Amino acid sequence: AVSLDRTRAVFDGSEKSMTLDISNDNKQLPYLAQAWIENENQEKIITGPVIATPPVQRLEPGAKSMVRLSTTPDISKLPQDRESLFYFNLREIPPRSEKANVLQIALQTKIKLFYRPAAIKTRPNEVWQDQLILNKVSGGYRIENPTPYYVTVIGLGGSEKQAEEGEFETVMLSPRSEQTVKSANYNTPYLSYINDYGGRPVLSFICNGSRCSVK
Amino acid sequence: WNNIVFYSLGDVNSYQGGNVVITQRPQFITSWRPGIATVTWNQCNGPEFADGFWAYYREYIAWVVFPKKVMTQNGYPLFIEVHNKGSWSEENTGDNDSYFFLKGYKWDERAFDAGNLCQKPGEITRLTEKFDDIIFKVALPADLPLGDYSVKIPYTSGMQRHFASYLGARFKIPYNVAKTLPRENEMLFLFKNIGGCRPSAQSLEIKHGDLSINSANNHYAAQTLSVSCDVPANIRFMLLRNTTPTYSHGKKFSVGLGHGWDSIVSVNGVDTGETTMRWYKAGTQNLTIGSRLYGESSKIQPGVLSGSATLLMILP
Structure with missing residues (x-):
């Protein structure tokens, strides 16, 4: 039962690689940690601008280890004024089971991977990236994002409680996109992000006609 | 005759690990820095002072006695790991309590320089030698409470000196006694546990x-x-x-x-x-x-x- 260190991983364009910890939290058996990279279409990329090494490794029961996300110079074919999307997976391979009729299940994490160029390299401080522009239309809001960064909005509501607790189908907004989402009109709205570091903040808004900026 | 002296730098500093999930392992960097290092331990069996008449061989070695584990003020105990040591030589797996990083600068340097070969406890010199940074990545248990932390981690760091009569000088401080040395240099570590x-x-x-x-x-x-x-x-x-x-x-x-x-x-x-x-x-x-x-x-x-x-x- 190996697992990752973080929910989501941000690749710095300045740097050549990065290490992600894994750990075999099962202490009775050894496991193999298959690790790989996928493109924005969630397909495998084997020579791809980013690669993960090693593709497989034995973790002895209880043993913690790493994986290395890294670059190939076909990264220069990527756009440098905005993040590009990948996903880093990890699949546990169990010891083939003792002989009986048995269905064997295998956990696999699949986090997001953000190639972020050096040109758009964020402040060490959690930078805002708060510029967002909820526009009212029939059926709800249409959320603008003219930042050069990927942004997953996890909730929308009337208050900080509703955004935190209330049901909502999560949406990831590509950099420089506008997208319609279904929601009741709110006099004062509240959108809940997921920041680089992983925690879920809440932005609060001020609606001046159709356009609603943050407070 | 063999003669050993140690100075402790007593460096102070802080490192922001930033916001991390419980499963995530945050990090800090323990930089070696020049400064005014005070003697705190020595083993002398030779001439007290040195003169121009007679030569003597040298051996200088660095030390960083960094603790293996620490506990937060909350009472939960943190665990430290070595992410990137550098050209330093860690040399003690057997002992659990502390890491033992060290580096031999000089060895058999035949020098005539007159001055003090045994500065007794409380005296000082200005150390001006650089070394690599030693990086540490910390382990957090799931039960760690959410929020802001500020773990003060004490450690020893300093340069051992070995002046010698014999050629091929090879004298090093024992690990047991190295542990007992004053942990004069310690750097506060600040990080935030969001949890996950x-x-x-x-x-x-x-x-x-x-x-x-x-x-x-x-x-x-x-x-x-x-x-x-x-x-x-x-x-x-x-x-x-x-x-x-x-x-x-x-x-x-x-x-x-x-x-x-x-x-x-x-x-x-x-x-x-x-x-x-x-x-x-x-x-x-x-x-x-x-x-x-x-x-x-x-x-x-x-x-x-x-x-x-x-x-x-x-x-x-």
Whole structure:
């Protein structure tokens, strides 16, 4: 039962690689940690601008280890004024089971991977990236994002409680996109992000006609 | 005659590890820095002072006695790990309490420089030699409380000196005594634990006892996984197919168990093979993986069944 260190991983364009910890939290058996990279279409990329090494490794029961996300110079074919999307997976391979009729299940994490160029390299401080522009239309809001960064909005509501607790189908907004989402009109709205570091903040808004900026 | 002297730099500084999940391991960097290093221990068995008349051989070695473990003021105990040591030589696995990093600068340097060969405790010199930074990455238990931390970590750091009469001088401070030296240099470490969810750490086998030949047609069994959590969280679960099934079920998810037998695998009562567990408030939640068997006499075959699946968690 190996697992990752973080929910989501941000690749710095300045740097050549990065290490992600894994750990075999099962202490009775050894496991193999298959690790790989996928493109924005969630397909495998084997020579791809980013690669993960090693593709497989034995973790002895209880043993913690790493994986290395890294670059190939076909990264220069990527756009440098905005993040590009990948996903880093990890699949546990169990010891083939003792002989009986048995269905064997295998956990696999699949986090997001953000190639972020050096040109758009964020402040060490959690930078805002708060510029967002909820526009009212029939059926709800249409959320603008003219930042050069990927942004997953996890909730929308009337208050900080509703955004935190209330049901909502999560949406990831590509950099420089506008997208319609279904929601009741709110006099004062509240959108809940997921920041680089992983925690879920809440932005609060001020609606001046159709356009609603943050407070 | 052999003569040993040590100085402790007593460096002070802080490092922001920033916001991390409980499973994430934050980091800090223990820089060696020049400064005014005070003597705190020595072993002298030769001339007190040095003059121009007679030569003597040298050996200078660095030291950083960094503690293996620390406990937060909250009372929870942190664990430290060596991410990147550098050209430093760690030289003591056997002892549990502290790491022992050291570096030999000089060895058999035949010098005539007159001055003090045994500065007694309380005296000082201006050390002006650089070394690599030693990086540390910290381990946090799941029970760590959420919020801001400020763990003050004491350590010793300093340059051992060895003036000698004999050629091929080889004298080093013992590890036991190195531990007892004043931990004059320590650097505060600040980090923030946002917290995060972690699934159950166990074998996921689902067992059916009897082959039963044909009779075990629609046999059922299932098993459950805990998924603990500190904060609010969405975890999209998706059963994935490894072993390709023999028969076809329309929108139901299926897996080949071999010998013309499938398992329609489900998760929280879902034949579709995808669910979503959500956390508004903290605490664990169970995830129930059904295996329903299925075969048909046309291709029923005697033999031991086994298949597999991959319950994929798409953490957004």
